[PDB]
Structure formats: C-alpha cells, structure tokens
Amino acid sequence: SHMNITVSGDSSQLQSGMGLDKLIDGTTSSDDSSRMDLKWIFTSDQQDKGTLPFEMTFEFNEPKTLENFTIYNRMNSNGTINIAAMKKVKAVGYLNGEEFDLGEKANITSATTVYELGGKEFDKIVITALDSHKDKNTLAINEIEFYEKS
Ligand SMILES: CC(=O)N[C@@H]1[C@@H](O)[C@@H](O)[C@@H](CO)O[C@H]1O
Ligand SMILES: [Ca+2]
C-alpha cells in the first residue's frame, strides 16, 4: 500500500529549509522548494559548509521487500543535469544486522538514478552521495522514492 519511511542523517550539513524531509515529501521536481541541498555557499570566505560524502539513512518500521529505490536528480529545464546534482552514489542495505552491498553508480547524468533490487528484503537502506557535478561542498537531490514488491 503506502509505505512509511523514516530518514535520518546529519542535518547540520544541509541548507536551512532544504533538509532530509525534502527527500520524502512527495516532490520530485527540481524546484528549490522540492529539494534537499547541502549548505549553500553565500560568501567567498564562508567556513560553515556541508561536505561529501553525505550519508542518508532510510528505515522502515518492519522489513520490506523492494523492487527498487529511485533517486530524482536536480535537472535543468532543458533536460541536462544541473551542476549541483549528484554525480556518484553508493548504497548499502541491512536486514537483521546482515549487510548487503548494493553497489555504486557513477557518472550520473539522468533525471533518475534507479537501484533495481529485485525484491530483496531490507529494514534499512543507507545511501551515500560521494560526488556532485560541482565540488565536494555541493549537492542537490529532489526526492528518493522506494517501490515495494507487490
Ligand atoms: C540558481 C542556482 O543554480 N543557484 C545555486 C543553488 O541552487 C545552490 O546550488 C547553491 C549552492 O551553493 O549554489 C547556487 O549556485
Ligand atoms: Ca522532494
């Protein structure tokens, strides 16, 4: 049906008003109001910054069998990937403490990054943004969606 997801991670890395909740608020557009962003850089001497790698933890209140999860990347209006978007990501799944390497996806250029899970069962998934298209202090993600196996 509808699947309750809890997201956690270091909110001190993120831009005000653009926190972890924006990963699961049901907004997949690239608008500022939809996204989770690492702290924006406002001045040339700013020392308060977020840094990659950035780890995002997703938990379900009970194990779920998943078809996939889908990361929605920040895109420009012309369909090209924005400079602040994710470029490289890895993920790990857990079930009863057992750890499962879900692998890394690199050179991301598309509107979505999809981890096909083929009905594997997890109670926790940890997604780590490793690189963006700009620098290690920049990251924008529109949404991350989880699709349950029937
Ligand atoms: C118009 C535009 O793209 N503004 C971006 C902002 O969205 C965010 O990425 C910020 C991070 O420092 O940098 C700006 O360049
Ligand atoms: Ca969103």
Numbering used by the authors: 3 to 152
Q: Which sentences did the original study use to describe this structure?
A:
As part of the secreted C. perfringens CAZyme arsenal, the bacterium possesses an open reading frame coding for a 220-kDa family 31 glycoside hydrolase (locus tag CPF_1301 in strain ATCC 13124) with predicted α-glucosidase activity, which will be hereafter referred to as CpGH31.
In contrast, CBM32-2 displayed a clear binding specificity for GalNAc. The GalNAc was well-ordered in the crystal structure and provided sufficiently clear electron density for modelling the monosaccharide into the binding site of CpGH31 CBM32-2. Notably, the binding site lacked additional sugar-coordinating aromatic residues, which is an unusual feature among clostridial CBM32s that has only been previously observed in the non-canonical galactose-binding CpGH84A CBM32-1.
